[PDB]
Unconditional design. Sequence first.
Lengths: 49, 49
Amino acid sequence: VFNATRFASVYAWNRKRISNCVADYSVLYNSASFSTFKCYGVSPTKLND
Amino acid sequence: SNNLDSKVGGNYNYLYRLFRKSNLKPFERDISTEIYQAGSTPCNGVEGF
């Protein structure tokens, strides 16, 4: 999802389905890499619980 | 009170607290303007990442 060499154009925004897996944020949310990370109905700290 | 305190160009005089370090106590009031730290880094001064 995040470390792909090339992303899509926005006129052709891809949709990658995700299933049968564990969603650990610890190398994502705690990173400096994302210039804006916002969740609008859940706290980003609670994405593990 | 739409006809009594709402402006065509936007009334921006009214504020709400979107960020705080902790869950506020009953009938307690919070005057603070200290910058909230969403990232893991400390964040001294008037602004930061």
